[PDB]
Amino acid sequence: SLVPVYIYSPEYVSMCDSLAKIPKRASMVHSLIEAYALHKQMRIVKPKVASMEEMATFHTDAYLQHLQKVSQEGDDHPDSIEYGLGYDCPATEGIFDYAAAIGGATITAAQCLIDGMCKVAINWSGGWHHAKKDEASGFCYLNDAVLGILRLRRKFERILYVDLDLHHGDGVEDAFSFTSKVMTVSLHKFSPGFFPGTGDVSDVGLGKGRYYSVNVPIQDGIQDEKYYQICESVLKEVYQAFNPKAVVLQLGADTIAGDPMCSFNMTPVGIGKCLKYILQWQLATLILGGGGYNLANTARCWTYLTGVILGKTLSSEIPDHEFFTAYGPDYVLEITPSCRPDRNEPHRIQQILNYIKGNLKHVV
Ligand SMILES: O=C(NO)c1ccc(-c2cccc3ccccc23)cc1
Ligand SMILES: [K+]
Ligand SMILES: [Zn+2]
């Protein structure tokens, strides 16, 4: 029960890379982790494929059946737009098998936590937080985070979902916005015209779930210190108010300097501090990836974070391995922040934190 579970198989990695949208990302992430020999220090668990019934715990039968149908051949289906397919989510080959593989991997991790096999279980290929019950959205065919949380609900009465991806985790928040059993906390860029457009600090959930959604809207250019100060302030209060029994943590690396999104200016060290703070609660914790469009930097980030989970210090030099040539121009693990300004006004941040502190008092 001591060592983290690492969700992995060569078949799963090949499947995760098989669509080539973020080409070879899963292989690069695993290969760097392997290059640093971190997998030796972890319990490698082969993921299972999600069954129809498991996927149906969140997604509608109509959506799953459509996804399954357009997956048989290539397939332009008249119903595809209704289901969010055709643009960011093309209806490709075994798209359904891809979705079920990713959904299954996160469920497997969750089941490992339930069975007490580990206290931390990692699926770096999961974290597809935008998908809705009946619609693909924002590159997400299926919401594995929701599927993971719903699996955890078999055992845990209160689950905290923390989303540190650059984007608002609207899909997970919406799934649980009416219930107090799951609190969702998203730190994200929030700006008119920036996807997905939701998640202002006034977004607090609905009905019985009111005040169980927490949103921290942040502006371009935030760096490690300020981000950690915000994240720690919110998590300290969320922990006190909500007393979570299990945590699902999404760590999308599109906040990291050098990402094409070019919005936040974080390094993996700052995200690592937030992760450290969550790890100290010593709860069952399900670790997911997410966005991250600079491949080398994303691998850098999730590898570093795996080190944080294992309590290891990694060498600064990127080890010789399959993708060593992608790590230019410095070929080191550290990431240097970009020279552009932090657009966050300290008093605006403080007002947001106060508003959140106020909301969390209602949590009972
Ligand atoms: O990593 C991401 N989230 O975690 C992500 C990145 C970019 C976009 C995204 C941004 C803007 C417009 C879009 C229009 C259609 C589909 C996706 C869009 C959506 C999500
Ligand atoms: K987020
Ligand atoms: Zn994102």
UniProtKB/Swiss-Prot annotation:
Changing S27A: Enhances the deacetylase activity. Weakly expressed in most tissues. Expressed at higher level in heart, brain, kidney and pancreas and also in liver, lung, placenta, prostate and kidney. Its EC number is 3.5.1.98, 3.5.1.-. It comes from the Eukaryota. Belongs to the histone deacetylase family. HD type 1 subfamily. Its cofactor is a divalent metal cation. This is Histone deacetylase 8. Interacts with PEPB2-MYH11, a fusion protein consisting of the 165 N-terminal residues of CBF-beta (PEPB2) with the tail region of MYH11 produced by the inversion Inv(16)(p13q22), a translocation associated with acute myeloid leukemia of M4EO subtype. The PEPB2-MYH1 fusion protein also interacts with RUNX1, a well known transcriptional regulator, suggesting that the interaction with HDAC8 may participate in the conversion of RUNX1 into a constitutive transcriptional repressor. Interacts with CBFA2T3. One of its GO terms (cellular component) is cytoplasm. Changing D88A: Complete loss of catalytical activity. Complete loss of catalytical activity. Residues 2-311 are annotated as: Histone deacetylase. The gene is HDAC8. The lineage of its organism: Eukaryota, Metazoa, Chordata, Craniata, Vertebrata. Histone deacetylase that catalyzes the deacetylation of lysine residues on the N-terminal part of the core histones (H2A, H2B, H3 and H4). Histone deacetylation gives a tag for epigenetic repression and plays an important role in transcriptional regulation, cell cycle progression and developmental events. Histone deacetylases act via the formation of large multiprotein complexes. Also involved in the deacetylation of cohesin complex protein SMC3 regulating release of cohesin complexes from chromatin. May play a role in smooth muscle cell contractility. It is found in: Nucleus; Chromosome; Cytoplasm. GO terms for molecular function: DNA-binding transcription factor binding; histone deacetylase activity; histone deacetylase activity, hydrolytic mechanism; histone decrotonylase activity; Hsp70 protein binding; Hsp90 protein binding; metal ion binding; protein lysine deacetylase activity. The keyword Lipid biosynthesis does not apply. It comes from Homo sapiens. A divalent metal cation binds at D165, H167, D254. Pfam families: Hist_deacetyl. Substrate binds at D88, G138, Y293. One of its GO terms (biological process) is heterochromatin formation. It is linked to Cornelia de Lange syndrome 5: A form of Cornelia de Lange syndrome, a clinically heterogeneous developmental disorder associated with malformations affecting multiple systems. It is characterized by facial dysmorphisms, abnormal hands and feet, growth delay, cognitive retardation, hirsutism, gastroesophageal dysfunction and cardiac, ophthalmologic and genitourinary anomalies. Its activity is inhibited by trichostatin A (TSA), suberoylanilide hydroxamic acid (SAHA), 3-(1-methyl-4-phenylacetyl-1H-2-pyrrolyl)-N-hydroxy-2-propenamide (APHA), 4-dimethylamino-N-(6-hydroxycarbamoyethyl)benzamide-N-hydroxy-7-(4-dimethylaminobenzoyl)aminoheptanamide (MS-344), 5-(4-methyl-benzoylamino)-biphenyl-3,4'-dicarboxylic acid 3-dimethylamide 4'-hydroxyamide (CRA-A) and butyrate. The active site is at H130 (proton acceptor). Binds 1 divalent metal cation per subunit.
